[PDB]
Amino acid sequence: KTSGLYTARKLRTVRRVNRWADKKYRKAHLGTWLKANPLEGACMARGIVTQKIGISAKQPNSAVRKAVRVQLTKNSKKITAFVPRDGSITYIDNNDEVLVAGFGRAGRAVGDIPGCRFKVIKVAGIGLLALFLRKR
Amino acid sequence: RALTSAGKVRKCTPKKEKKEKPRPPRGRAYKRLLYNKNFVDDTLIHNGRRLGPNNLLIRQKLGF
Amino acid sequence: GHTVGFCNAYQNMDALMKYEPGFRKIRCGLIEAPKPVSRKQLKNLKNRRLKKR
Amino acid sequence: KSGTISTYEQAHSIKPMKFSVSPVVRVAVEPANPKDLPKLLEGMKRLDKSDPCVMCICDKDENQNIIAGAGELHLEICLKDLREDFCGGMDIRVSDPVVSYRETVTEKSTKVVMAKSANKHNRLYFEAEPISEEVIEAIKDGEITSEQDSKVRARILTDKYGWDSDEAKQIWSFGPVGASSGHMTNLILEATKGVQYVKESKEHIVSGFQIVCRNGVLAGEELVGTCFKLRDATFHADAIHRGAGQLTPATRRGLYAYASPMLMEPFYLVDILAPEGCMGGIYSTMSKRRGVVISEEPREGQPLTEVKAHLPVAESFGFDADLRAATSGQAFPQCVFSHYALIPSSPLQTGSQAQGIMLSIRKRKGMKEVVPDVSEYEDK
Amino acid sequence: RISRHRNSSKTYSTPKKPFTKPRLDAELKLCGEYGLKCKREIYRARYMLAKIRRTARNLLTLDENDIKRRFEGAALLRRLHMLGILDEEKDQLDYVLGLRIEDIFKRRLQSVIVESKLAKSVHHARNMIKARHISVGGQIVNIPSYMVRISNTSRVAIADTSSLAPNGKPGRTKR
RNA sequence: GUCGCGGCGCGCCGAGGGCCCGACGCCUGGCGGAGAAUCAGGGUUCGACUCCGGAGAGCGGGCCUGCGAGACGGCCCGCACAUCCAAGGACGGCAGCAGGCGCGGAACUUGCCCAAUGCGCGGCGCGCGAGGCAGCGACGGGGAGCGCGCGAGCGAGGCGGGCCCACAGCCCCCGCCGCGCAGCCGAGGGCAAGGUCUGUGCCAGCAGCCGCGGUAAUUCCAGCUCGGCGAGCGUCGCGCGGCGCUGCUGCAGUUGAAACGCCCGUAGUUGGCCCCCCGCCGCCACGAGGAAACGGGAGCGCUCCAGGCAGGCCCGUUGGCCC
Numbered sequence A: 001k002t003s004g005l006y007t008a009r010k011l012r013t014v015r016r017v018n019r020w021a022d023k024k025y026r027k028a029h030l031g032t033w034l035k036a037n038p039l040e041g042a043c044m045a046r047g048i049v050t051q052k053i054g055i056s057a058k059q060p061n062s063a064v065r066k067a068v069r070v071q072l073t074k075n076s077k078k079i080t081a082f083v084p085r086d087g088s089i090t091y092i093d094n095n096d097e098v099l100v101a102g103f104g105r106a107g108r109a110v111g112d113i114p115g116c117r118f119k120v121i122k123v124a125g126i127g128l129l130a131l132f133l134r135k136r
Numbered sequence B: 001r002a003l004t005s006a007g008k009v010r011k012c013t014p015k016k017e018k019k020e021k022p023r024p025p026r027g028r029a030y031k032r033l034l035y036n037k038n039f040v041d042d043t044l045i046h047n048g049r050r051l052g053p054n055n056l057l058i059r060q061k062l063g064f
Numbered sequence C: 001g002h003t004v005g006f007c008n009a010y011q012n013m014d015a016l017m018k019y020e021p022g023f024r025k026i027r028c029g030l031i032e033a034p035k036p037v038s039r040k041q042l043k044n045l046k047n048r049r050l051k052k053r
Numbered sequence D: 001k002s003g004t005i006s007t008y009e010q011a012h013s014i015k016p017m018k019f020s021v022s023p024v025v026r027v028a029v030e031p032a033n034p035k036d037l038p039k040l041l042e043g044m045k046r047l048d049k050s051d052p053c054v055m056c057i058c059d060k061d062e063n064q065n066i067i068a069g070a071g072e073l074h075l076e077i078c079l080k081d082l083r084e085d086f087c088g089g090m091d092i093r094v095s096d097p098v099v100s101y102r103e104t105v106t107e108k109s110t111k112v113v114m115a116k117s118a119n120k121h122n123r124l125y126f127e128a129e130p131i132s133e134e135v136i137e138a139i140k141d142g143e144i145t146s147e148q149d150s151k152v153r154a155r156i157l158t159d160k161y162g163w164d165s166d167e168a169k170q171i172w173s174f175g176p177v178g179a180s181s182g183h184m185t186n187l188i189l190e191a192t193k194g195v196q197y198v199k200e201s202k203e204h205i206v207s208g209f210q211i212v213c214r215n216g217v218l219a220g221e222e223l224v225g226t227c228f229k230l231r232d233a234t235f236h237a238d239a240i241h242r243g244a245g246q247l248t249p250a251t252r253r254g255l256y257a258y259a260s261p262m263l264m265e266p267f268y269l270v271d272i273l274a275p276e277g278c279m280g281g282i283y284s285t286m287s288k289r290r291g292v293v294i295s296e297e298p299r300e301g302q303p304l305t306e307v308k309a310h311l312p313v314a315e316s317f318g319f320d321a322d323l324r325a326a327t328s329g330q331a332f333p334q335c336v337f338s339h340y341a342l343i344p345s346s347p348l349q350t351g352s353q354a355q356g357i358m359l360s361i362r363k364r365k366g367m368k369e370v371v372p373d374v375s376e377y378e379d380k
Numbered sequence E: 001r002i003s004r005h006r007n008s009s010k011t012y013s014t015p016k017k018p019f020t021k022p023r024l025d026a027e028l029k030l031c032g033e034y035g036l037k038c039k040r041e042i043y044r045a046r047y048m049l050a051k052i053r054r055t056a057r058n059l060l061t062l063d064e065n066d067i068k069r070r071f072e073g074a075a076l077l078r079r080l081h082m083l084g085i086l087d088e089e090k091d092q093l094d095y096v097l098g099l100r101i102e103d104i105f106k107r108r109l110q111s112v113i114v115e116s117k118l119a120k121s122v123h124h125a126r127n128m129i130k131a132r133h134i135s136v137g138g139q140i141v142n143i144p145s146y147m148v149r150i151s152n153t154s155r156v157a158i159a160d161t162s163s164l165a166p167n168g169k170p171g172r173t174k175r
Numbered sequence F: 001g002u003c004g005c006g007g008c009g010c011g012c013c014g015a016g017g018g019c020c021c022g023a024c025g026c027c028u029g030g031c032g033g034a035g036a037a038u039c040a041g042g043g044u045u046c047g048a049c050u051c052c053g054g055a056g057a058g059c060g061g062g063c064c065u066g067c068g069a070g071a072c073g074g075c076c077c078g079c080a081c082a083u084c085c086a087a088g089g090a091c092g093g094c095a096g097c098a099g100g101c102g103c104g105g106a107a108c109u110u111g112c113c114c115a116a117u118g119c120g121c122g123g124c125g126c127g128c129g130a131g132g133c134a135g136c137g138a139c140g141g142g143g144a145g146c147g148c149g150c151g152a153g154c155g156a157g158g159c160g161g162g163c164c165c166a167c168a169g170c171c172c173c174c175g176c177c178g179c180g181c182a183g184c185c186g187a188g189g190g191c192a193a194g195g196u197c198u199g200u201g202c203c204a205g206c207a208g209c210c211g212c213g214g215u216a217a218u219u220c221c222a223g224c225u226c227g228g229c230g231a232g233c234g235u236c237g238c239g240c241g242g243c244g245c246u247g248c249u250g251c252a253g254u255u256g257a258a259a260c261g262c263c264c265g266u267a268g269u270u271g272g273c274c275c276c277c278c279g280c281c282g283c284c285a286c287g288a289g290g291a292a293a294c295g296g297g298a299g300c301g302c303u304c305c306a307g308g309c310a311g312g313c314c315c316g317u318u319g320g321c322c323c
Helices: A008-019 A023-029 A032-036 A128-132 B028-039 C022-026 C040-051 D034-050 D072-085 D133-141 D150-160 D165-169 D190-195 D198-212 D244-255 D280-289 D319-326 D353-364 E021-034 E040-061 E068-083 E101-106 E110-115 E122-130
Strands: A044-056 A064-072 A077-082 A097-102 A118-123 D025-028 D055-058 D065-069 D102-104 D123-130 D173-175 D180-185 D222-224 D226-234 D265-267 D270-274 D292-298 D305-311 E134-136 E156-158
Touching: A023 A032, A044 A077, A044 D034, A064 A097, A064 D034, A077 A097, A077 A118, A118 A128, B028 E021, B028 E122, D025 D072, D034 D055, D034 D065, D034 D072, D065 D072, D123 D244, D133 D150, D133 D180, D150 D165, D173 D198, D180 D198, D180 D222, D190 D226, D198 D226, D198 D244, D265 D353, D280 D292, D280 D305, D280 D319, E021 E040, E021 E101, E040 E068, E040 E101, E101 E110, E110 E122, E122 E134
Parallel strands: D102 D222, D180 D226
Antiparallel strands: A044 A064, A044 A097, A064 A077, A097 A118, D025 D065, D055 D065, D102 D265, D123 D226, D173 D180, D270 D305, D292 D305, E134 E156
């Protein structure tokens, strides 16, 4: 490493250039992710579900995980979001407003749902969890 | 030999009405009752030695 | 029972009328409560006045 | 649209009743821009608030948004409103809504049909049997439901519907996705011991049924009123050669969907009520729209006489104006809804109405054209 | 708004690891012994002790009689001695280390009324303070965790209007 | 020319001036600081907003009045979008406080009032959407409940009175009756708590992660118990810690990712030993002098507390001192 009393500039430059090498820093501070994310820095976003589809489970699990093809209103970007809980796809109908929020992996995919980056939270302005518990 | 089947299990599960339960003591009273479940009395949580709160052996000494 | 409060003892009657704040005088009933205006009524009248005279 | 407000906490509501027909004239609004599909639904809600005689619903079957109006002029008046006042301009195309259809087997199958699998190691023989309406009415009622002990429904079918007692006990499942009309049944059982593999294979014959009953051989519409009988089967010993991939496709060719067609039929209908004092328009319009007036009850206390006519959903478009003109705005088509009815022509024949309506369905859904043969998907 | 000017602060620290059972069991003993409704009350006193002991750690490193050592050592030991968290015999910065959640809990007043025999049990004592039946210098306190001081220990007593020849009617007697 | 200084402007006369110690260009989801978050240490991240300094009033220009404004609750003009018309004309400017619309995952009443606190004008009081006061408010922070004990009682209420308040109300104090009430996530491992009983049979679903479910399921769906936190709990996004996975402290490069194929070489960085005495350095020590808030901290029982600088017959009673 550089070891001079007058080598502060070189050390600052190295950190600046080397810092972007870590993948998480590049995702967080490059700004490419902020443009790309269907939810642009938002915790979640509203959308209309064009198609109710089921995504086959990746191995070794076997299941038709239920998903919705939703067009987010803020960016007009269509996306796939998992409808969580047992048999709760029934509440979702196509042409219905929904709110889609992340799967907790920060844009990554969780478990055996291939290429699913988000989960529906509220359908027709009512939380999905409440409907499955029959609260509403 | 194994999308339309949403709720294959939840729809077909036997409905059990919840058991009548007497209202528990809340607040510090629950802290007192948890203290009485293990730290005091000790007889409820004992099979002659220290044991788990939901042991099958602890059950049947507590009824269920 | 313990209470904390403050007393303004005016040497003469006039100093309770003058040096003391007015609301405290109506609160002892020395004056009769008047009906002034709605404040909005004052401001809206002042705004109509500003257009004419 | 309408509401009641009370400062009193314990007060009941007030409700209206618009005599002027119902949202009878229906049209499908579709945006030119798919990215303009969120702002259409938004301005439809606002247009719903405007008048009770207009509605905004999605057809449950084809998820097609529908705006239904009480008059041809009032639907246009609300289309102009939806076109500019609501949705602030934007492009939206009116069209007649698609009419849903069902497929049914009309007679016992001519012969058992074999279905060799891709492996060729497994064979399936099936027969198609129409369910009697009385059994179907009990299916709808709940006397015979998929969700019941196997034996209890068997006793009902044998002791009231003259079913074969063994067949009623061996019923594998109901169809389509839900347990409505459509049944799957097992073999004779002397050869069930002799088939030796049906028990493990039951979930393939169940999954194939859940497909075929959703999409009929004729045009991909839901099958109804059918009993699929695995009269016979021969299977390989290994489960490597007996799987969903091998047997569920073999089942779908064998069951019905161009693979097992024997006797087939399409379905549709609706019901209209007209308070009207003059029945001359009522008969002429219904006769043209292919509807039949099955009722004519004079209100005893009034000059107006209410009639009820079963009208095909396809021919309902246009009748509302026709009936106004056939009468003179004296007759009010009211609520319109009902069941499905057998089309008179056969989808097998060429010049038949059915083969025209059937080909149109697979042309609309882009599936294919003219059913050619059972031979296309049948192994002899 | 000068409301913005008002400072507010969290008074407790949560555990770094939520499910350490040895600790969870040790805490349950404290709650049952001291009649504490929730673990937050156990954490608030842990925070108070942490700061107090962090300050005496810093002070001990400072050289003896370091002017700031003399000035800040007194205000620590002397304010703890008044509170009574520390017995007055020790009076040196070395023994602030060695205090426990129980020492803070000992002066809570729930404990002080049980200690002088006024209240049979901590559970009864909490119920007593919330019904305005305990007093310190004739102050009707509604606060179970009053944190009573050494001098005010003697004054703690039954309230003037609750049990010793008072009205003694509202409540059960009035019926 | 300006208030003055200055390429500030203009002639004239030179040819400079800046830069690998990164000039210039480009870009920003750029106001900066005091600070905020997290937090051994060294740091990382955020600097909308509370105070200070800057800038702006749809977007540009130009001015007038002024002691001060290139002022927009001044004017004029072009632009962009409006408004009323009797058809010729006139007239806008909520990044004030309310309120709507659009937008978004998201963010309050079209209240009441100058009584405080300051400011303007006035010496005997008016004005102020500055502010204050309520309303809404699980951003959050704080303090109490849902019993205790075998006998007593409460507070949540309810209703009058005080008190409070600009006016209410709120708290609090009274008499008078008196109505206690838990959720939200979990029980295979990490990670605390069922080898319980059903349903279901790689289906449905669960599961951050590892993994569960293909007929005796510690993981799903119920019931049953039980855990954890608790009037809050779970979820999603972000920052910090974790992370010595950014490494100055303090990473690694034979084979895990990574020594340029070699050699010369300028900037850059780094330089053996050597003079005791000072001159300039850097360096280090302590000075002055520098806003508070905040943070740390002295004292002080707001019932405790989050607080607040109070209070008590009092250092010149306080309100220190540190940054």
